[PDB]
């Protein structure tokens, strides 16, 4: 019945990254009070904006739960944000932080891992604009694979698929290759001509390349070139997982919208072992408070 | 009038399958016999066929029949038409009527019941065949081992054997596949050296199920199966670039590859209406 640390009255779980922020507000006893969404809070977009994003979304959580906003000193907050890998961004973030009773900062992927397997050992492979694999071992340890970053890494992510798709189209445009369905679809998407791809590729970002991913999906059923990209993404996803668990000893969940759309191209032996995640990242952020720093 | 029995024969290296019917279509019997691929001897082929036929009549509760009362269609591996096939016809019993063709073509007729369409048959070997609305016929793949027969059992086996050889001499790490193949072959260097020394398409194909099994835990094997799936689709596309014809994947291997097939190809796939023996019957009609 009693709760530890009577000064802490609220438990907050925050999931933030690239496109938005999701917050789960709970009572110190575990009672789910509210759940809210807000703007993006990836650290790469700014520390001050990140907090403004998290706080504004937290402000909505209380309101939504018919409760007056509580002082920071009465709250324990765990956050899984994109950009925590960067030591410098995490520091300014922790430094610019309100006076929460307790703050636990982890990455986007770690809290997704914790939520997917309810805090129990396991692995997750997250495929979105980018990609990463995270694992929690029975001995308490944690490891990562993949997730090194956009240009060179991020295999099986949609930015990876977009880059390849764009490259194939560029090759079709200058004669190194002939056109194919994917290639024609990408050319129209881009603007319809040489100049258009040149301009488009000139200002490309991970999010822009990722917008080509759905074009690879549609084209793959009629174009062997797109089919190979999807298949390679499938193998790379498996490779991420095998590096974290060589003997397939732990449970595995495939997170991300791209992951659901890629299912048919996942190696059968890897797909067969997938399990639905028990909770989302915001849930995992809550679990962060229930463990050591 | 004279013809009282209709015979469907499907012959290859794996065996001979026969469907026996009455001139009116009534099912009389089904029987399987030994290998009758023309590559192993014309006389040997006939004796395997005739022996299987004799068995069919016996299971039909009918007395031994005379060739003159039989109409027979055969789909056998042997495309030396007018040569190996020319010989087969010459050495043939006095049937009321005989119609010869490759097992690929009868697999074709059976799959789409004589309608236009294409098939890709994966077995110890592989080949693609198509029948178009203009009555025309074409094929792709099927050039024979070892340079051809992509996506076949022998294809899969060669690569499985090569990976095992590489593991054995140090230019590759052992993996689930290589351990399986090594054990299957004899457990050591000398065993693989001996096994590969007398290797044949059928022998390599015997390794195919080892690849299928290991694919679930070995990325190497999964890659080969996926390559087979891509090669199959490639075969089909060469015969029908615009996907205007029905397509069927035939053969035991064909069915085992389902999950490794390119999704778009698999979705377009239709199942074979009848087997090769059933296509053999259609051949004589």
From TrEMBL, chain B:
It comes from Chromobacterium violaceum (strain ATCC 12472 / DSM 30191 / JCM 1249 / CCUG 213 / NBRC 12614 / NCIMB 9131 / NCTC 9757 / MK). InterPro entries: ATPase_BadF, ATPase_NBD, Euk-type_GlcNAc_Kinase. Transmembrane segments: none annotated. Residues 7-283 form the ATPase BadF/BadG/BcrA/BcrD type domain. It is an enzyme of class 2 (transferase). Its EC number is 2.7.1.59. GO terms for molecular function: N-acetylglucosamine kinase activity. The keyword Lipoprotein does not apply. This is Probable N-acetylglucosamine kinase. Keywords: Kinase, Transferase. Pfam families: BcrAD_BadFG.
